[PDB]
């Protein structure tokens, strides 16, 4: 877009996705770093 | 050119290939590869040693608990009662507001899946010199609700499945926890940040000291006991859903408390500027874009009758830059159905305009228009850094 | 004030690449200014004759809906390396400025898909065309460069 | 209903089937035929005798030149020197501004194609009684540029390819012109109306009188010679482009001289009418459509400073009809970026308004608004016939 | 007409065929060819002698260095130390601001590719009469970082791979540079105009004089040595990316210094003209198009408080033409969120309007509106040539 | 998931399957049937006896003419001369403005087709007692233009094809009319309501009385003769076009006389109501829709200069309902390029406003605005019934 039309584009979302594509092959095993449980995350609080 | 007069196929468009599907399904792409038949390859020394699989990960012990075991533990003493589900736990004593937890590899690979079933395996390394001797139960009680989690003692434990062990020369074993439940699979103990739909564990492990440790005087009074968890031979998981776990790579978190005030999402970054529908462009108002009719909208302040409010940013660095940083503002409806924010010179002018607008006054009034900042003050018009928080100053009318 | 028939712009179509257009000093076309030339012209730099097709895939602006025709004009001689560039045709005065009957052409409907794809063929009475930069020595050398002279025009 | 879960084909739309392609290519259609397998057929007496082909057309003589050949032509005399390309010519002495030309069938079928090659064949019918006798060269010189087209004489001609012929009893022959050029094909002599890219002919024919005609006293001093052109056995053409020829079915042509003034293309037919952005609908202005904001745009008149201009249509019949035909107009910018045309009662009011607008005045001015034609004059609102020419009246300010 | 009631295929549209792919992949087209089965062909004398290939280009020497080699070079003397990567160099001593460089064919064909590997080959033509005699090392040191590029001398060189040569009768050889690196391929030394991601060379060549030249008195004291580079037998490149090289066909370049002022991109060419939202069309303002609401936008001038600015074009030829060329302008916000540029008669009026607008004044003010140029001055309305630079005149308020 | 990197098919969309085609062509549908393989079936007693076909319909007689045949017809007397095309006719003596006609089945099935050819067959039932005796020609003259349709008599008829018949005992025959024409098919005699392209019949039948009837005194002087038409063995039709015939199921028809006045098509039904661009919503104007800017447009009344006009509906029932039915209106241009209709209280106010608007007045004028109906009168706002006719009242100014 030329700058005249670029104004329509401002603050429009652009989400992105990904997946490992079949040919992917992770190698050496390495243990998990500490997790953080999600249901234990703080509430918004009214 | 024979003509092809017969009727065309009748297909229905969709915008996108399936995101969920991921197996027996060719998935067409606009490859950024040069050759169209090319595909990544593995030179003989770069070969993938590890066959990623839920079972290949589940079948790896990770230390999950470290019981101390002193001589003076009487025959009844509890050592642990960790739940018989993969999500066995060991909290880190960190300073963080949101504490991290260790997990067994089975406890992480099984958080990704809604359901699990089959045996677990708790290896117990009872770390002792051969001259230490003792005996301990490692029981398993099916169907203990948390209210029944207490009232336990080793003798009630003996009624159900259990395993006695004799620490003497061999100093390690591997109790293989049974899967006893009415449910062919079993639902996750935790969940994506959503407390309901967090079923507690099927059953509970126990490890009481059946015969108290009897050390020689020349060896230690205390014995460590390591509890390792591993997915059993029959451990298996099915439905994929949101992991109940997040990596510690970034432990930042942001509460959505409503008390602080800020521009509506998607209307920031904003900068002070002119707009033709307001005071005929003579006076400033925040804008999220250079194009016309792109004024930032603002949340309606909750003002109880007989009072008034005006804004003051918590950080003057983040305010949009005019001739001066704009730390002060008065949010009023634009008459276009959304609440425009009007920057002001100072807290005083803002308080005055606030006295006017809640005073039965209106934007068109001369007493108000004097208080609006004139367009010449627009300056460079730098955008505010992100969507900065606005403290809500409040005063009696 | 263009009519339905007037070509909007016309450019010679050759492997050598168009003479590089940085643009005016005030308004550079940043890619040619910065990412000089490219690959295909860089390899076209390495040889002295060529004999083959080209493909184009013009990408029209999205906001416009209007139909778009594309002539190929094998007849036209390139006239020196100057004016080997895209040209915004002005008032009609010759047949250069308008749709023509015989010349091979195609008409994308911008509303359906706004990127016409092409296959400019090799039509020259030559063994094989010049491939470096071209200053036109022979008057008949001028037929010895461009495959043609494509013309895009809105209706 | 088994579900069909596998990924869909990924195709790219285009709006239209190829226009250029026309051979080995099925071309799908919405037939207006009833039967979908139907196709036009030829009953045995309606069979297509003629196999249309470039060669079947090229292989037909058409008279192309008619040389006179008098007794008193000395041995050196030229009779013709027509170029050795199919585009051999014979102008008609018409009264038309754009003169028509005869062509050989090869000269028309080869105008459609960018390139040609191979032999031509000029039959020469030397029309004479057997009692006439004479001899003539019919030479061919490769590579004659037009500057060398002169300096020719039969003796320089003999140096290159040529063919002597002896008119006595048989009185006709068929010189077969050679294709000598450095270019495997040869480009068209003419072109679509575009003078550059009009290569001149490869080589030139000549026909000098090698031995002057020697008639008996009782037969004519003069002999006609017809020159017919035919595509040779090897004549062949390749690339299809715009024909350099047009049919005489309509020899009308329209110069695009800029001196006359007219509404911009696509903004006519136009009629006088109201429009809300101009004088609040009180006054007339031309419109190309009933819908709002469809005022006709007009070209900017080139007025040198210190002067003024106003329009007057060349034909009062073509003016858009109001209460009176609108032969007079003042073109001024609308402030919407385009030049509206304002109809007026007469040349005088138009001159006055022109004196005002170039006089530093403006459309909003009272002195101008009095001069605008009031809306009630709109009448039937008939459209102007096509896009009629406007003569530009000009006066000193 | 049997009905075809079964469900249609479900495909997903994309707008365009892949740009990246270029091998095992049929690519559908709207051919401008006539025949649909036609394809370009090569007549037997027009056959493509050269099989274009990275290796067929890499396997061609190009002179890349020209060492001088005087008699009085002692045994230790360096002659060159060019890097052992294809991008070996020989700058031209041109007058251009951006100097051109010669490359070996391997040095150009390998600039197109991100990565390379394998042997190079430096032929050395030691140009001498057979009566010249001498000896020189042509070493290769793996793993020299640029800090270690110095401290070299032939004796440290002898520790690693090297090749002694004896100039006597045969006067040429071809050292074949080894590929020693920890990286199976090697990344490009340069890059598209982006300095980071420009890895320096794997290793360095050297050519010290092992035994100093010993000429006869009747032959020259100096011997030239040509260094030619060629892709070796195993030279090979993989990933295609932006060439780090550009042709010298056009060496023009344009710095994007911000100091000069100009209309925003896509809003030029512009011409002076009326616009209804500004001064009710009475006064001029620049426009990039005839249609309504197409005013040119302008960058916000950075004016420090207490000062003012107004524009003056560097070239009066490029200014948009009105009754007079418009060399002067005052850029002010339009109240529509973008900065319109207002043409003025002269630097003085521009300075006055600038004094007003930064003086707390506004466009609607009578004192300003007098300074605006009246619409009648619009003239022919010729567009400015391209997007001409505007010098920013500045004055204290 | 192997990736599918190869290029997608390139197809061109069309919105709709062919309407014309109707044979060898599968036509895909969204069936409203449940089963997708289902198709209508015919139980053995519901089987389709009739094989619909042009020939199966053409081969059925329908009475088409009823000649009377009195004793006192002399030998020359004509009985009928119906045209030798299927469209033979027998008008009904109805009271309808548009009279119905009987047709032979061949005369209806052949109206659907542009062209016909082949023999017809006129059966003649000469209804008589065996005691009646007589003889009659049943000739056929090829190529009679309507000017030659007269001048006929049985003796000129005998020159061309004809068939004598002897009424005595057998009292019926079946003359088989020949197809003689220069045209292999023959074009329809009538056509879709479009008089040109209505070729008249190829040739004409005749039936003169070759020997006058000679009844006994005890039997009737008159004999009826029925003429039945049937498509012959070779009768056949080709191109399908608009039937030249319509069913009598509804013989209503509507002339498009321009004299009555009505709202433009697609702008009715309309109701009185407010609109912001007119008198600032204070006054009524007709609307075809609730949404803004949906005023009904009206045709421009043709008012000669010096006169005026205002509307009055022919039926007060169909007027749009306000507080009162709106039988009166003044149509004036809106200044938006279309003629709005302004409802008024009565014929008098309408005449006054008409005196004003053609009086050099305008809608904005106070004298006019008083005459406009105030918004409060809008009432229920019921729509007018359809698009009711408006009589145009006219008065001198
Ligand atoms: O829309 C349609 C569907 C099927 N068909 C044809 O019907 C036949 C059966 O289609 P399926 O593959 O069952 C096959 O010949 C198709 O080409 C059409 O021509 N058009
Ligand atoms: O987008 C695609 C492309 C191919 N395919 C399948 O892949 C297979 C190979 O396709 P092709 O005809 O080579 C065939 O079984 C197709 O149906 C898909 O299912 N989806
Ligand atoms: O959307 C669809 C997909 C497949 N099919 C049919 O399913 C069958 C298998 O398709 P594939 O080529 O595997 C084949 O008969 C298709 O015509 C449909 O009818 N509609
Ligand atoms: O756009 C296209 C056209 C054909 N093709 C392939 O080309 C081959 C020939 O197609 P057809 O049926 O002749 C076949 O393998 C198709 O799948 C594509 O891959 N893409």
Residues B89 and B55 sit within 8 Å (Cβ to Cβ): no
Write the CB contacts of E322 (distance below 8 Å, at least 6 apart in sequence). Answer: E272, E284, E343, E373, E377, E378, E379, E380, E381
Residue found under tokens 């004059």: D377
Closest by alpha carbon to D319, among D272, D254, D372, D380? D272
End-to-end, the C-alpha distance of chain B in Å comes to 85
Cα(F26) to ligand 1 centroid in Å equals 7
Burial of B122 (0-12, 13-18, 19+ CB in 10 A): buried
Burial of D134 (0-12, 13-18, 19+ CB in 10 A): buried
The alpha carbon dihedral of D381, D385, D386, D387 has a sign of negative
The alpha carbon dihedral of E313, E316, E317, E322 has a sign of positive
Please report residues of B whose CB lies closer than 8 A to that of F14.
8
Residue found under tokens 């396997």: E59
C-alpha distances (whole Å) from B157 to each of B165, B206, B208, C23, F1 are 15, 8, 9, 86, 50
d(CA B81, CA B150): 10
Residue found under tokens 């690959």: C39
3-class SS letters over chain D? CCCCCCCCCCCCCCCCCCCCCCCCCCEECCCCCCCCCCCCCCCHHHCCCCCCCHHHHHCCCEEEEEEEEECCCCCCCCCCCCECCCCCCEECCCCCCCCCEECCHHHHHCCCECEEECCEEEEEEEECCCCCCEEEECCEEECCCCCCCCCCCHHHHCCCCCCEEEECCCCEEEECCCCCCCCCCEECCCCCCCCCCCCCCCEEECCCCCECCCCCCCCCCEEEEEEEEEECCCCEECCECCCCCCCCCCCCCCCCCCCCECCCCCCCCCEEECCCCCHHHCECEEECCCCCCCECCECCCCCCCCEEEEEEECCCCCCCECCCECCEEEEEECCCCCEEEEEECCHHHHHHHHHHHCCCCCCCCHHHHCCCCEHHHHCCCECCCCCCCEEEEEEEC
Which residues sit with their C-beta closer than 6 Å to ligand 3? Answer: D 4; E 6-7, 9-10
Residues D357 and E376 sit within 8 Å (Cβ to Cβ): yes
Write the CB contacts of F148 (distance below 8 Å, at least 6 apart in sequence). Answer: none
Phi, psi (deg, nearest 5) at residue E244: -90, 5
Starting from the edge strand earliest in sequence, which strands make up the sheet with B172-175, in order?
A: B62-70, B222-231, B120-127, B172-175
Residue found under tokens 């495959």: C147
Buried b / exposed e over A4-25, threshold 16 CB at 10 Å, is beebeeeeeeeeeeeeeeeeee
The finding on whether B5 has its CB within 6 A of some atom of ligand 1 is no
C-alpha distances (whole Å) from F38 to each of E73, F28, F32 are 101, 14, 11
Note whether F34 contacts E: Cβ–Cβ < 8 A: no
For residue D29, what are its two tokens? 């259609």
Residues D38 and D78 sit within 8 Å (Cβ to Cβ): no
Residues B102 and B127 sit within 8 Å (Cβ to Cβ): no
Please report residues of E whose CB lies closer than 8 A to that of A2.
265-266
Phi, psi (deg, nearest 5) at residue F330: -130, 115
d(CA F233, CA F59): 8
Residues E185 and E139 sit within 8 Å (Cβ to Cβ): no
Cα(F53) to ligand 1 centroid in Å equals 28
DSSP secondary structure code for residue F375 in this structure: G
Write the CB contacts of E356 (distance below 8 Å, at least 6 apart in sequence). Answer: E365, E367, E368, E371
By three-state DSSP, how is residue B170 classified? coil
Starting from the edge strand earliest in sequence, which strands make up the sheet with B328-333, in order?
A: B339-344, B328-333, B307-313, B390-396
d(CA D384, CA D377): 16
d(CA E83, CA E149): 10
Residues pairing with B122 in the sheet = B175, B229
Residues D112 and D243 sit within 8 Å (Cβ to Cβ): yes
The finding on whether E28 has its CB within 6 A of some atom of ligand 4 is yes
d(CA E196, CA D254): 63
The alpha carbon dihedral of E376, E382, E385, E386 has a sign of positive
For residue B296, what are its two tokens? 């930032």
The finding on whether D9 has its CB within 6 A of some atom of ligand 2 is yes
C-alpha distances (whole Å) from B301 to each of B351, B365, B387 are 15, 22, 17
Q: Do C104 and E46 make contact, defined as CB atoms within 8 angstroms?
A: no
DSSP secondary structure code for residue B320 in this structure: P
Residue found under tokens 């329809």: F188
d(CA D243, CA D87): 12
The alpha carbon dihedral of E369, E373, E375, E381 has a sign of negative
For residue D159, what are its two tokens? 């140096």
Please tell me chain B's helix, strand, coil percentages from 3-state DSSP, rounded to the nearest 5.
10, 25, 65
d(CA F37, CA F32): 12
Write the CB contacts of A31 (distance below 8 Å, at least 6 apart in sequence). Answer: B60, B62, B105
The alpha carbon dihedral of E34, C97, C143, C48 has a sign of negative
Q: Determination method here?
A: cryo-EM
Kindly identify which residue of chain B lies nearest to residue E9, measuring between CA atoms. Answer: B11
For residue B130, what are its two tokens? 């051969």
Residues B208 and B262 sit within 8 Å (Cβ to Cβ): no
Q: Length of chain E, please? A: 397
By three-state DSSP, how is residue F121 classified? strand
Residues B165 and B173 sit within 8 Å (Cβ to Cβ): yes
Q: Do D12 and E14 make contact, defined as CB atoms within 8 angstroms?
A: yes
Cα(E36) to ligand 4 centroid in Å equals 15
Residues E218 and E99 sit within 8 Å (Cβ to Cβ): no
Atom of ligand 1 nearest to the CA of F28: 1
The finding on whether B306 has its CB within 6 A of some atom of ligand 2 is no
**What is the per-residue DSSP string for B346-397?**
SHHHHHHHHHHHTTT--TTSHHHHTTSPBGGGGTT-BPPSSS--EEEEEEE-
Residue found under tokens 């009646």: F132
Closest by alpha carbon to F11, among E28, D216, E167, B391? E28
Write the CB contacts of D155 (distance below 8 Å, at least 6 apart in sequence). Answer: none
The alpha carbon dihedral of F287, F289, F290, F295 has a sign of negative
Q: Is the peptide bond before D309 cis (omega within 30 degrees of 0)?
A: no
Q: What is the dihedral of CA E185, E189, E190, E194, to 10 degrees?
A: 80
C-alpha distances (whole Å) from D136 to each of B2, C153, D370, E61, F144 are 54, 55, 85, 64, 65
For residue E252, what are its two tokens? 């023009």
| Angle value at C-alpha F94, between F88 and F100, nearest 5 degrees | 40
d(CA A14, CA D37): 50
Residue found under tokens 């408006």: F390
Burial of F372 (0-12, 13-18, 19+ CB in 10 A): buried
d(CA A43, CA D156): 108
**Chains B and C share 3 or more Cβ pairs within 8 Å:** no
Cα(C44) to ligand 1 centroid in Å equals 48
d(CA B229, CA B60): 8
Residues D292 and F295 sit within 8 Å (Cβ to Cβ): no
d(CA E132, CA E127): 9
Task: Count Cα atoms within 13 angstroms, Cβ side, for E37.
Answer: 5
Cα(B24) to ligand 4 centroid in Å equals 23
d(CA B78, CA B63): 19
From the list F5, F27, F36, which residue is nearest E1 (CB)?
F27
Note whether E40 contacts D: Cβ–Cβ < 8 A: no
Q: Do E386 and C28 make contact, defined as CB atoms within 8 angstroms?
A: no
The finding on whether B11 has its CB within 6 A of some atom of ligand 1 is no
How many CB atoms sit inside 10 A of residue E366's CB?
A: 7
C-alpha distances (whole Å) from B39 to each of D7, E102, F3 are 20, 37, 9
Chain E closest-CA separation from residue D1 CA (Å):
10
Task: Count Cα atoms within 13 angstroms, Cβ side, for B201.
Answer: 25
Write the CB contacts of E69 (distance below 8 Å, at least 6 apart in sequence). Answer: E79, E126, E134, E209, E213, E222, E223, E224, E225
Residues B17 and E12 sit within 8 Å (Cβ to Cβ): yes
Residues E326 and E347 sit within 8 Å (Cβ to Cβ): no
C-alpha distances (whole Å) from F82 to each of F104, F122, F126 are 13, 11, 17
| Angle value at C-alpha F259, between F257 and F262, nearest 5 degrees | 90
d(CA D5, CA B21): 8
The finding on whether D6 has its CB within 6 A of some atom of ligand 2 is yes
How many CB atoms sit inside 10 A of residue C150's CB?
A: 26
d(CA F111, CA F99): 17
For residue B233, what are its two tokens? 């031979």
Atom of ligand 3 nearest to the CA of E6: 19
3-class SS letters over chain E? CCEECCCCCCCCCCCCCCCCCCCCCCCCCEECCCCCCCCCCCCHHHCCCCCCCHHHHHCCCEEEEEEEEECCCCCCCCCCCCECCCCCCEECCCCCCCCCEECCHHHHHCCCECEEECCEEEEEEEECCCCCCEEEECCEEECCCCCCCCCCCHHHHCCCCCCEEEECCCCEEEECCCCCCCCCCEECCCCCCCCCCCCCCCEEECCCCCECCCCCCCCCCEEEEEEEEEECCCCEECCECCCCCCCCCCCCCCCCCCCCECCCCCCCCCEEECCCCCHHHCECEEECCCCCCCECCECCCCCCCCEEEEEEECCCCCCCECCCECCEEEEEECCCCCEEEEEECCHHHHHHHHHHHCCCCCCCCHHHHCCCCEHHHHCCCECCCCCCCEEEEEEEC
d(CA C99, CA B340): 53
Please report residues of C whose CB lies closer than 8 A to that of E268.
26-27
């Amino acid at each position: 877009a030329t700058s005249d039309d670029i104004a329509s584009i401002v603050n429009k979302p652009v989400t992105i996705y990904y997946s490992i594509g079949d040919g992917m092959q992770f190698s050496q095993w390495v243990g998990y770093q500490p997790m953080m449980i999600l249901d234990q995350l703080p509430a918004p609080v009214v | 050119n024979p003509s092809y007069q017969q009727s065309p196929r009748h297909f229905v468009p969709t915008g996108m290939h399936s995101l969920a599907l991921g197996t027996n399904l060719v998935e067409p792409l606009h490859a950024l590869r040069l050759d169209a038949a090319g595909t990544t390859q593995h030179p003989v020394g770069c070969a993938p040693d590890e066959d990623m699989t839920v079972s290949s990960i589940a079948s790896r012990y990770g230390l999950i608990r470290r019981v101390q075991w002193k001589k003076d533990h009487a025959k009844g003493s509890l050592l642990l009662q960790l739940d018989a589900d993969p999500f066995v736990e060991q909290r880190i004593e960190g300073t963080n507001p949101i504490s991290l937890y260790w997990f067994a590899p089975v406890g992480v690979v099984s958080s990704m899946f809604m359901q699990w079933r089959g045996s677990l395996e708790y290896r117990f390394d009872i770390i002792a010199s051969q001259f230490h001797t003792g005996r301990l139960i490692v029981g398993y009680v099916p169907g203990l609700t948390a209210s029944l989690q207490l009232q336990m003692d080793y003798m009630k434990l003996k009624s159900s499945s259990y395993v006695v062990f004799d620490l003497q020369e061999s100093n390690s074993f591997t109790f293989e926890v049974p899967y006893v439940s009415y449910r062919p699979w079993w639902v996750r103990k935790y969940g994506g940040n959503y407390l309901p739909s967090s079923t507690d564990a099927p059953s509970t492990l126990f490890m009481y000291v059946q015969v108290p440790l009897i050390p020689m005087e020349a060896v230690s009074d205390t014995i460590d006991i390591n509890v390792y968890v591993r997915g059993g031979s029959s451990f298996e998981v099915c439905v994929p859903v949101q992991p109940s776990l997040g990596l510690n790579w970034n432990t930042d978190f942001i509460l959505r408390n409503d008390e602080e005030y800020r521009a509506k999402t998607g209307y920031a970054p904003y900068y002070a500027g002119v707009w033709h529908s307001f005071n005929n462009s003579n006076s400033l108002v925040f804008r999220w874009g250079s194009a016309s009719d792109q004024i930032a909208q603002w949340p309606t302040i909750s003002v109880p009758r007989g009072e008034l409010a005006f804004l003051r940013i918590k950080d003057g660095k983040q305010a949009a830059v005019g001739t001066q940083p704009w730390r002060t503002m008065v949010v009023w409806p634009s008459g276009h159905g959304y609440n425009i924010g009007i920057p002001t010179y100072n807290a005083e002018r803002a308080r005055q305009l606030a006295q006017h607008l809640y005073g039965g006054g209106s934007l068109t009034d001369e007493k108000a228009k004097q208080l609006f900042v004139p367009a010449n003050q627009q300056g460079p018009g730098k955008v505010s850094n992100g969507n900065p928080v606005w403290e809500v100053m409040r005063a009696p009318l | 004030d263009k009519d339905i028939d007037h070509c909007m712009f016309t450019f010679p179509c050759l492997p050598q690449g168009l003479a590089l257009d940085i643009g005016s000093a005030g308004s550079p076309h940043e890619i040619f200014n910065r990412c000089r030339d490219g690959i295909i012209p860089l390899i076209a730099s390495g040889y002295r004759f060529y004999r083959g097709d080209l493909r184009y895939k013009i990408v029209f602006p999205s906001n416009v809906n209007s139909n778009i025709w594309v002539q190929h004009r094998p007849d036209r001689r390139l006239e020196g390396w100057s004016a080997a560039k895209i040209v915004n045709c002005d008032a009609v005065s010759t047949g250069q400025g308008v749709y023509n009957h015989g010349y091979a052409s195609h008409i994308q409907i911008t509303r359906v898909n706004n990127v016409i794809e092409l296959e400019v063929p090799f039509y020259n009475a030559t063994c094989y065309n010049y491939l470096q930069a071209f200053n036109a020595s022979s008057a008949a050398s001028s037929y010895a460069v461009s495959l043609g002279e494509i013309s895009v025009g809105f209706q």
